[PDB]
Amino acid sequence: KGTFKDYVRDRADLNKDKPVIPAAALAGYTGSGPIQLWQFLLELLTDKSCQSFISWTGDGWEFKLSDPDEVARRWGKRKNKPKMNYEKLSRGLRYYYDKNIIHKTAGKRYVYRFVCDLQSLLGYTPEELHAMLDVK
Amino acid sequence: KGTFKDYVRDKDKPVIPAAALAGYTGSGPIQLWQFLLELLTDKSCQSFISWTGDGWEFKLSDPDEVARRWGKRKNKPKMNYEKLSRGLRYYYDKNIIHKTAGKRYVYRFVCDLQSLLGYTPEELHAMLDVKPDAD
Numbered sequence: 001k002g003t004f005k006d007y008v009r010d011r012a013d014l015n016k017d018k019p020v021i022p023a024a025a026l027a028g029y030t031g032s033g034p035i036q037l038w039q040f041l042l043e044l045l046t047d048k049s050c051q052s053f054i055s056w057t058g059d060g061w062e063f064k065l066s067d068p069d070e071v072a073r074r075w076g077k078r079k080n081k082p083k084m085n086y087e088k089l090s091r092g093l094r095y096y097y098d099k100n101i102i103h104k105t106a107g108k109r110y111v112y113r114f115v116c117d118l119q120s121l122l123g124y125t126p127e128e129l130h131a132m133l134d135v136k
Numbered sequence: 137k138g139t140f141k142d143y144v145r146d147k148d149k150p151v152i153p154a155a156a157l158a159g160y161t162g163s164g165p166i167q168l169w170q171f172l173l174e175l176l177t178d179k180s181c182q183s184f185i186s187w188t189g190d191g192w193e194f195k196l197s198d199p200d201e202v203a204r205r206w207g208k209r210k211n212k213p214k215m216n217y218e219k220l221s222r223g224l225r226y227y228y229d230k231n232i233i234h235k236t237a238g239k240r241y242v243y244r245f246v247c248d249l250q251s252l253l254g255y256t257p258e259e260l261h262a263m264l265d266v267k268p269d270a271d
Binding site for chain 2: 007021026029
């Protein structure tokens with residue numbers, strides 16, 4: 001067990017992958033109150049550790065979902081909404097399609113793309129984050 | 137005004153964050169004694185709550201402000217010092233926090249925090265620049 005001081009030290013020495021765009025801060029910034037799906041997606045995209053199931057493609061704000069179900073799950077376990085899955089996640093993406101926040105790339109299986117002006121909202125450029133995340 | 141990048145630009149966290157202590161102790165939801173520890177280990181709260189200099193003894197210079205803060209951290213706006221006192225009374229039965237006889241709004245942690253937190257009262261007082269009260 002050890003003490004709290006050892007716990008902090010150890011976590012600070014081990015845990016080393018904090019998302020560049022935390023959905024939480026983003027909701028506070030946009031004053032959206034409750035966490036939003038598009039904000040959550042950004043958090044996962046600006047987190048190297050998640051590059052296993054979700055990452056940028058290198059072309060603008062385009063990103064692919066290597067494992068859609070992993071996003072859906074982490075989406076349901078983050079909003080404390082276990083009743084949330086890939087299906088209840090697919091409904092959220094189409095809303096974003098009609099609201100022009102995220103568009104699906106034609107031909108691709110699970111390759112979406114943010115179509116709103118993120119650069120003016122986040123302050124970062126696509127190529128910038130791409131470099132901060134070692135995007136390939 | 138200003139992009140998110142600029143928004144992030146706008147003192148460090150307290151030594152004993154309640155959330156962390158909760159994770160560490162596995163209590164799950166934040167507990168009042170853990171929250172009190174955070175305010176006591178945060179230089180920016182010394183106006184309404186602070187250490188007295190004598191071990192784990194602390195006092196509430198602004199009880200209502202503590203109760204109000206505790207309210208926002210757990211989403212309970214109707215929170216006042218009366219309710220908070222119920223919490224303190226409970227902590228007196230669980231031997232976590234005791235009240236100092238004679239004084240008012242002066243309590244003391246009586247559990248072995250030193251063995252839990254890994255800090256000594258003297259160590260924390262220095263990191264927070266605490267001056268011993270007068271009596």
